[PDB]
Design a protein around this ligand. Structure first.
Ligand SMILES: COc1ccc(S(=O)(=O)N(CCO)c2ccccc2CN(C)C/C=C/c2ccc(Cl)cc2)cc1
Ligand SMILES: [Ca+2]
Ligand SMILES: [Ca+2]
Ligand SMILES: [Ca+2]
Ligand SMILES: [Ca+2]
Length: 144
């Protein structure tokens, strides 16, 4: 993995690790999931951790987070369409910088307006300034 790839994998880890202690717990995962419109049970949350908890300490650290990421990037298209609907709040089929800003805000992240534009620009393929589903699939999965 390149160094750019790595510092971004470290930013994703920070969204889930709210308290910043280097571990992702079931309570931190349930907080993120609910901020994304989901509602996992206590058992579903433990299962998410158990699938990648190699050392058996009940939490997810950075190596196990990178293993979880490599798995999700399965062929469960519904998981991707569900995530798209969370960004696409007005449902018109295109994620705007404003809608994307709103999502990061509900995850409590402090971001600049340009930083949101950089995020759109990297997922944008046709150049229309927004992210449709096909571009979303390629951003979320190993497609292309
Ligand atoms: C239901 O399954 C999920 C769960 C969480 C997310 S996630 O998006 O929270 N996520 C970031 C934390 O790892 C993520 C998770 C897994 C894989 C990829 C990502 C996206 N990252 C790389 C940055 C993405 C940047 C980006 C840009 C442009 C647009 Cl329009 C939208 C997003 C997605 C689907
Ligand atoms: Ca933590
Ligand atoms: Ca662990
Ligand atoms: Ca939209
Ligand atoms: Ca686009």
């Amino acid at each position: 993995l390149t160094e750019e790839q790595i510092a971004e994998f470290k930013e994703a880890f920070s969204l889930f690790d709210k308290d910043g202690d280097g571990t992702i717990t079931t309570k931190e995962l349930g907080t993120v999931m609910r901020s994304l419109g989901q509602n996992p049970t206590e058992a579903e949350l433990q299962d998410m951790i158990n699938e990648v908890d190699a050392d058996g300490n009940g939490t997810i650290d950075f190596p196990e987070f990178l293993t979880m990421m490599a798995r999700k990037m399965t062929d469960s298209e519904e998981e991707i369409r569900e995530a798209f609907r969370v960004f696409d709040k007005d449902g018109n089929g295109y994620i705007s910088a404003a809608e994307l800003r709103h999502v990061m805000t509900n995850l409590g992240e402090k971001l600049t307006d340009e930083e949101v534009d950089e995020m759109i620009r990297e997922a944008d393929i046709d150049g229309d300034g927004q992210v449709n589903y096909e571009e979303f699939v390629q951003m979320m999965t190993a497609k292309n």
